[PDB]
Amino acid sequence: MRTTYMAKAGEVERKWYVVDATDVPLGRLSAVVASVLRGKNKPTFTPHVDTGDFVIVINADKVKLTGKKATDKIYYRHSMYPGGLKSVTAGELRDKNSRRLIETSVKGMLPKNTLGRKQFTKLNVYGGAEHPHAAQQPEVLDITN
């Protein structure tokens, strides 16, 4: 028992970031976004407290799928009933519910604690190019990642 910082709940200020998605693949967008929300890129970790930030996503959508996988990465859902596998999606989710792409391929990237739920509700994914959240003054990142 000696001196290292263990941050409290209301010590670390949060921010608001804006990220485009024009022709970047899924894995690297999701990787940088999921490393934002735990509180990395800030020297004041805990593994207890939400030290992360808020992330808004524009232009869901215009995300690439490199080479093929336009018709290939079949998702799967099962409904706990006999024979109930529903492979209803494909790369079709680019067209419709492009919210639903990034809300799966980021939820996989996170832990599955209770912090993997309080750190998931800070995403906002919009397929268009509009902030309804302009009341909160968000900033812009630059991805060379």
Binding site: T4, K40, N41, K42, P43, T44, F45
Partner: peptide, 12 residues
């Protein structure tokens, strides 16, 4: 301490 050195080093 490695993770905190990671973040603060990447800041510079």
């Amino acid at each position: 301490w490695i993770a905190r050195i990671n973040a603060a080093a990447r800041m510079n």
